[PDB]
Amino acid sequence: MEQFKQFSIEKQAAINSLLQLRGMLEMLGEMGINISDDLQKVTSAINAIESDVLRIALLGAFSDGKTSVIAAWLGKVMDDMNISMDESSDRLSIYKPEGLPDQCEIVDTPGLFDGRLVMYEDLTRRYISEAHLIFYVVDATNPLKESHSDIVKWVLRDLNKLSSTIFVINKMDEVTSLTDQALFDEQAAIKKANLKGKLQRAADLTAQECEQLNIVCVASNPNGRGLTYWFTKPEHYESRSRINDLKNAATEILKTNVPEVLLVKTGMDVVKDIVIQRVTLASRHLDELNTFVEKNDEDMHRFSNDIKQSRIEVKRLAGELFEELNLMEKQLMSQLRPLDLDDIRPFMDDELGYTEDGVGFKLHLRIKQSVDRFFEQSTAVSQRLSDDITRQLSSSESFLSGLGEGAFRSLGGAFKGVSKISPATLKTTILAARDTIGKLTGYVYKFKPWEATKLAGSIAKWAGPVGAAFTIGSDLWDAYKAHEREQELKEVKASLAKIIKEPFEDIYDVLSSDEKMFAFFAPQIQQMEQVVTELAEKSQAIRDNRQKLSLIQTQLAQLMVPAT
């Protein structure tokens, strides 16, 4: 991996990253977000970028052997790439060597190496800012000339190119043996430390910036023999010069710094930071929305289950109620059929009730207490149902309240403007459904008056005067013969049966049909079902939106993987 292939590669990566940016923009557009003309702006920056070529700013005094360092690194002696560098001109200058695998620009400011005016020229500042690599070449004996403080500051502080600058301590030969691997590294580390201290102090560097510094020790032209000669021995030279340490450092900077240079140069750094911000934000609040829409969708099914179970339970109670009332009636009837006329009054008193009003009060109260008990158990069922619906609605309200009123504005068009959807629009629909349910829910008291049944005069004479001790007189018993009396018994029993049966008949007709049964003992179950059914319908508009957005975010997440 060498310098022009790395660049060409980093160029392409940056172009790709911008095509993914374009893709990310199309999706925002799709969720009704701005764009203005960011799509065409991005295409333009891709085109501008295609032109660009590798650029190195070669900085340093010429006497520190800068020219050797760059030829060395490229691979070719200066004249073979038909270019020749001028020692003094008070301007910026650019060299575009030839016969190389690809093109590259070599920028420098020869005047500096009141020629210090070029540091404040927007032009020479732009050309060095927009370089991908900066070599500041210094001396091994006494690294960094005494006069250069403000140039180091210009590069590292003013222009802010520390991440892309390699200080190249050159001519290490005249400080150490190029043979003794372990001594070189000892002097190379001491010289790296020394220069580190002069730079930090020339440019106000912090301790952290100091660690970021790129320093490399090298011997471009070792012994003094020359490049033309040393290229003839390419693998001997590399071990001695340590030039590979420089190519490698340069390769890692390119790896990192080439895209930043290209993005900034075209103004796309800013475009891209904003787009990735809106997308990151957009999925973080789609996650919120999904949580709400999922929960709400699951509650709806949960509410219809509750209603089912509710209904199943009430049906079970209605049947138990019926079973209980049917025994009561069978029991009373089997007590009646064997009774002789003396037995009658005790029976009316003790089982039915016998008053001036008439007969039936005692039975009525006992039927009533059985009906009441069901009406209460069944009213409690409907109360447990209201409490679950009401609990879940409230936890949706509470989820949506913690989102913030602007939580969905990043999701674009449907959450902005006069028809906007928001946590508060959705909360409202929920709370009016919870309100309608808090008014349905109710124990009720409805008074149902009861009249007793008067006994026929004919049958009143076998019962006796109300509330008195009564046995049947001789005068009454010997007014009939047996067949005139056992018939008198039959029509009195006929009389009590009709009385006994009546109150059950009515209520069995109610329990025999679920429509009626429900309408009398548990109407709020149907009423709550209505409310739940309506709430379901009002939930469509977000479901429509959440779907579009999810399909959309799936694509965004894809486009965003490279950017992570």
Residue numbers in the entry: 1 to 113, 121 to 571
Verbatim from the authors:
Members of the dynamin family are large GTPases that couple nucleotide hydrolysis to membrane remodelling. Here, we show by sequence analysis and X-ray crystallography that LeoA is a bacterial dynamin-like protein (DLP). Here, we present data demonstrating that the leoABC genes, encoded within a pathogenicity island from enterotoxigenic Escherichia coli (ETEC) strain H10407, are dynamin-like proteins. This is important because LeoA has previously been linked with the secretion of heat labile enterotoxin (LT) through membrane vesicle (MV) biogenesis and release from the bacterial cell surface. Bacterial DLPs (BDLPs) share many of the qualities exhibited by eukaryotic DLPs—they polymerise, exhibit GTPase activity and assemble on lipid into filaments.
Monoclinic crystals of the protein in nucleotide-free state were obtained and the structure solved to 2.7 Å. The crystal structure of LeoA reveals a fold with all the hallmarks of a DLP including the key structural GTPase, neck/BSE and trunk/stalk domains. Helix 1 and Helix 2 at the N-terminus form an extended helix-turn-helix motif as observed in BDLP1, that along with Helix 12 and Helix 22 at the C-terminus bundle to form the neck domain. The LeoA trunk domain clearly shares the dynamin canonical fold as observed in other DFMs, and includes a putative hydrophobic membrane binding/paddle domain. This 90° kink between trunk Helix 13 and neck Helix 12 is mediated by Gly274 (inset) and represents the equivalent of Hinge 1a in BDLP1. After superimposing the GTPase domain of LeoA upon that of BDLP1 (apo and GDP-bound) and human dynamin 1 (apo), the LeoA trunk is observed to be fully extended, pointing in an opposing direction to the nucleotide binding pocket of the GTPase domain, and yields a ‘flattened’ conformation that is more reminiscent of human guanylate-binding protein 1 (hGBP1). Crystal packing analysis did not reveal any obvious physiologically relevant interactions of LeoA monomers with each other.
